[PDB]
Design a protein around this ligand. Sequence first.
Ligand SMILES: O=c1cc(O)n([C@@H]2O[C@H](COP(=O)(O)O)[C@@H](O)[C@H]2O)c(=O)[nH]1
Ligand SMILES: O=c1cc(O)n([C@@H]2O[C@H](COP(=O)(O)O)[C@@H](O)[C@H]2O)c(=O)[nH]1
Lengths: 217, 218
Amino acid sequence: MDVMNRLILAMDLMNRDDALRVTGEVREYIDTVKIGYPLVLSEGMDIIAEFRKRFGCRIIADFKVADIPETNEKICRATFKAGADAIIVHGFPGADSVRACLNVAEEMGREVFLLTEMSHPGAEMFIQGAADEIARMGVDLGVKNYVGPSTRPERLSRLREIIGQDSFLISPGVGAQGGDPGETLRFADAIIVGRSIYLADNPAAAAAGFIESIKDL
Amino acid sequence: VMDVMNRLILAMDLMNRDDALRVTGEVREYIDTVKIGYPLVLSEGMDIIAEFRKRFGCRIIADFKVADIPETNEKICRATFKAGADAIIVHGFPGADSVRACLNVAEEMGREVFLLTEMSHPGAEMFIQGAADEIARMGVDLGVKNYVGPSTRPERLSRLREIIGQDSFLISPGVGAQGGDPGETLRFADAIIVGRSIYLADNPAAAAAGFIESIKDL
Ligand SMILES: O=c1cc(O)n([C@@H]2O[C@H](COP(=O)(O)O)[C@@H](O)[C@H]2O)c(=O)[nH]1
Ligand SMILES: O=c1cc(O)n([C@@H]2O[C@H](COP(=O)(O)O)[C@@H](O)[C@H]2O)c(=O)[nH]1
């Protein structure tokens, strides 16, 4: 995957008008938008096709898929039907649940991103202790795309070590949650940025600023 | 606790509105509580919750296995309750802050959180099972009153019931298609969740009636 400016917009605004306006304002800086449940549950899955019609951007569906294999398959099918190019899947529910997603992705053209360790404080309770093993499971399953935490660069670096330089790694927690853009890009291929752009007084200036920060990367 | 008719919750995972509405209507004399998840919601929109309420008397549990950071969890819960869900199911594995975010929204909006502890599928043994007793204990500490645990592992469901206490409410999937037994599961769970064994049946009403006959003494 080739992400313009190594910057993925996390579009978690919850109304269509604002979400479309803000995305339009920063469109020159990106070609990849992560759309999650806050927007989809507020405005419907039709929002994905609309983003493609308006912006001709890549769409990552951040649905943190975390069900049994049978249900995971249905979720992936519905999601790719809506025009998502990729979907984010939790590793914690185990290999069969990940494989179900990989199967559908193969069938419909698309990519699976495996979420290993999460960026928020609560990730330390259960996820962190499992995260290296989750990454190894991804490697065993042939997963090529991964998500790991900007807020813990040593954990992100370890994730990169496990999956190797050939795998693709994106990383949230930049800005609002405390992660640094430049440091994150030592290890990740792209950074995910939500609030620091979409809640900014001037989202365009915010996006430009991030790119300035990582300009020599 | 919610008064689940016949201790039986329909897992409505059909992916088109017409079939989902048909099947739910056919079993409505037997079931007043319907679990709606992402297969249906991502196919037909959140307004499907409204359509179910309009057509049927039914309580709606949104099985969204919420598993994000606290800030995103709050948004998901808000959107879900705005749409009319009585309750939402949240994963415990992302930790206490993520669960608390959901509880806080549920409290403000006058709705309920169900905490998913251990899962019913084989993959659950890899990571979830080893954390599940602690996830459940965490739920109790956080004041969670409603839980989900696996019919496919009676020993684990029994332990989960111990941890949460007799006063907590416990619902359990994996009955039928995944191999769990209705009666055995009701030793520990307040209600069983049944999907495919009802919604793929030639006569879903007959299938529901059959489940109820098998648990009539309970
Ligand atoms: O470990 C993780 C995985 C996520 O996808 N995300 C998500 O990435 C985004 C972060 O946005 P923000 O920059 O506003 O903190 C959100 O959409 C959120 O759900 C996260 O913050 N940490
Ligand atoms: O541990 C779990 C938690 C779930 O919510 N569920 C879910 O409960 C249902 C099971 O349906 P079924 O009876 O067809 O196997 C599905 O909606 C599924 O996603 C599960 O099977 N095991």
